[PDB]
Design a protein around this ligand. Structure first.
Ligand SMILES: [Cl-]
Length: 256
């Protein structure tokens, strides 16, 4: 049958067509090997599946060769944007690949980069944007500083529009990088919030005269050991108090 001289010549004839233009008209290439257009496509489908050649096939029966330099351009474009819509990526496509790609074709490329471990991204829950885990860290920090310095991780999930695990995975990154930021009972808490909390404790101290840690823990819903170390760290710089030890750690005004 066909396959003896076909399989040997097909790949070299394909390459000869790729040298002339990275865009291959599969109907036209099917004339140069004298084959059925559908049989021609199927062998290219198979060659892409085997991992033999890098490219995509549009809805109108053209194949597009993509160089490793052009893949690298696609991966770096998504890195630099951090968050980007599949629609933006299709518009950008001609500047990155010298060919205007369908949204589908762009997805096929991104999924290739993911599998070859040349890019690290995640799908938004609407399926409409790609976001980098570096950009998730950034958008967690922006929404933390925005929402006052204390925010639940579950609220950041809703906001950033990505599955929970992709927020939960960046918590190593936000505590190594930001020495001012800490994880407490499913929330991220900012140096700026603890200073603001210390101010409103000192205002309630200069009114009550005295106040107990167990009363502040019920007031702000924070754990004892954490809240004690956060307030005792701010004693004298922000709180005009004196610590003493009762049944519980207790704070009262010195200048009284
Ligand atoms: Cl991941």
């Amino acid at each position: 049958g066909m396959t003896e001289e076909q399989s040997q010549s097909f790949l070299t004839e394909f390459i000869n067509y790729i040298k002339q233009s990275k865009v291959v008209l599969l109907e036209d290439l099917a004339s140069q090997v004298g084959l059925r257009t559908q049989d021609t496509i199927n062998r290219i489908q198979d060659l892409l599946a085997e991992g033999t050649i890098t490219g995509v096939i549009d809805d109108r029966g053209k194949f597009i060769y993509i160089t490793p330099e052009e893949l690298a351009a696609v991966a770096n474009f998504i890195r630099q944007r951090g968050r980007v819509s599949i629609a933006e990526l299709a518009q950008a496509s001609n500047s990155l690949i010298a060919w205007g790609l369908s949204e589908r074709n762009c997805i096929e490329i991104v999924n290739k980069l993911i599998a070859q471990k040349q890019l690290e991204v995640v799908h938004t829950l609407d399926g409409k944007e790609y976001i980098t885990p570096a950009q998730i860290s950034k958008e967690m920090r922006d929404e933390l500083h925005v929402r006052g310095g204390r925010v639940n991780i579950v609220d950041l999930q809703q906001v950033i529009n990505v599955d929970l695990i992709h927020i939960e995975n960046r918590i190593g990154d936000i505590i190594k990088s930001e020495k001012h930021v800490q994880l407490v009972l499913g929330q991220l808490i900012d140096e700026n919030y603890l200073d603001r909390l210390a101010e409103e404790v000192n205002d309630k101290l200069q009114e009550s005269g005295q106040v107990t840690i167990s009363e502040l823990c019920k007031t702000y819903d924070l754990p004892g050991n954490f809240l004690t170390q956060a307030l005792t760290q701010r004693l004298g710089r922000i709180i005009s108090g004196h610590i003493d030890l009762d049944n519980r750690g207790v704070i009262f005004t010195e200048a009284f």
